[PDB]
Design a protein around this ligand. Structure first.
Ligand code: HEM
Ligand SMILES: N[C@@H](CC(=O)c1ccccc1NC=O)C(=O)O
Length: 370
């Protein structure tokens, strides 16, 4: 209804793995980035490409796949080996069809979370369920970059939150119909589903190691919105005349935390800059059906006001359980950022990044009712 799945939520159900034979030249380069980058040939291959019309991408999953391919080539081309030797101009034969496909999908021409997590996965055996050991990513950047661990655990955290988003309708039917036990059961189910997502987030440490992420994988996830290396943005040759700035693909582009902010009345959604607006800016990097889900959610009556006006220590307790699960997620997430960003940057905090994350948690903490 809003491109949300029952089993995988904001994730794309069974992504396409193949593009039509017309696009083999893209697929070949995208599937061999680790070789081509290491050998210092990637840029030469990109420049030798021909302009390939997007006209033969006629279904959504194949356009999704084509954006993942083009997004990964774009990251590799711009940054190269990550040795500070950057390219400031995306060649015309890639930039035009990429920008055209991105306009059709209503996404910025940069690699986003919906590309490299939500659409970048396959089941090893389809008859066996969605667990790490039975899944693989579709593209990677450098050997030992831990893209498989980072992407798949993100996805598995995404899939765990999915089992909460399917209760969200029932929360609202229950409020409407003055249905006290249902609403209390429903909020409990959400809190327990947010709790299972926190368990799943623990799998990060045995599939990603801090140095691979911080010094290899992070390079190719970096964008050009306020980045000293491309002080002015990127030139999408033959599509726009002046450079453009787009944010690098943080997992901050996930809709999961915002979905439950909006549902719980937590005013991250609104507020003061350097915080509420970064979360608003980050909405522009999410698929359009998902942008709409978040907006429709706000239009709904407040759950926090409903629960507040009922003198019901039961409803207040279940609502607080959901608030408390959210606070744990961001707290654990603060741990994750320390190990995978701060200590490695510290070994050759110092960035307000932590004040952003901490601010967001404190807001979540101050929404507790009782
Ligand atoms: C595993 C290593 C991870 C690192 C190093 C990391 C890093 C970051 C950073 C740096 C930000 C702030 C945005 C920015 O400045 O780029 C952020 C925010 C965020 N991250 Fe991640 N992240 C990781 C994993 C995850 C995972 C698995 C999720 C699962 C949903 C997630 C969800 C979010 C969300 C929702 C935000 C927005 C801030 C908020 O709503 O609290 N992150 N993260
Ligand atoms: N080490 C440099 C150059 C480089 O890595 C590179 C990688 C793939 C294809 C071409 C490259 N540079 C010049 O042709 C860099 O950081 O981009």
């Amino acid at each position: 209804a809003y491109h949300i799945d029952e089993e995988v939520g904001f994730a794309l159900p069974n992504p396409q793995e193949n593009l039509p034979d017309f696009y083999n030249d893209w697929m070949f380069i995208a599937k061999h980035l680790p070789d081509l980058i290491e050998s210092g040939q990637l840029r030469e291959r990109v420049e030798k490409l021909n302009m390939l019309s997007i006209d033969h991408l006629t279904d959504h999953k194949s356009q999704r796949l084509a954006r993942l391919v083009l997004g990964c080539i774009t990251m590799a081309y711009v940054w190269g080996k990550g040795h500070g030797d950057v390219r400031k101009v995306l060649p015309r034969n890639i930039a035009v069809p990429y920008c055209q496909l991105s306009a059709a999908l209503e996404l910025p021409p940069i690699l986003v979370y919906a590309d490299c997590v939500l659409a970048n996965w396959k089941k090893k055996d389809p008859n066996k369920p969605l667990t790490y050991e039975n899944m693989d990513v579709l593209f990677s950047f450098r050997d030992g970059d831990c893209s498989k661990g980072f992407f798949l655990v993100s996805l598995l955290v995404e899939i765990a939150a999915a089992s909460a988003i399917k209760v969200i309708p029932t929360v609202f039917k229950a409020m409407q119909m003055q249905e006290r036990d249902t609403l209390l059961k429903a909020l409990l189910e959400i809190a327990s589903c947010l709790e299972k997502a926190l368990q799943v987030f623990h799998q990060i440490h045995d599939h990603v190691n801090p140095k691979a992420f911080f010094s290899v994988l992070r390079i190719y996830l970096s964008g050009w919105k306020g980045n000293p290396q491309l002080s002015d943005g990127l030139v999408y040759e033959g599509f726009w005349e002046d450079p453009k700035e787009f944010a690098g693909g943080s997992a901050g582009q996930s809709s999961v935390f915002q979905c439950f902010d909006v549902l719980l009345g937590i005013q991250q959604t609104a507020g003061g800059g350097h915080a509420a607006q970064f979360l608003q800016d980050m909405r522009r990097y999410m698929p359009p059906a998902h942008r709409n889900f978040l907006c429709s959610l706000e239009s709904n009556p407040s759950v926090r006001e409903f629960v507040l006006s009922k003198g019901d220590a039961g409803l207040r307790e279940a609502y607080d359980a959901c608030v408390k699960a959210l606070v744990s997620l961001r707290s654990y997430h603060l741990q994750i950022v320390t190990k995978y960003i701060l200590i490695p940057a510290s070994q050759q905090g110092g960035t307000d990044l932590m004040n952003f994350l901490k601010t967001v948690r404190s807001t979540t903490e101050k929404s507790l009712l009782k």
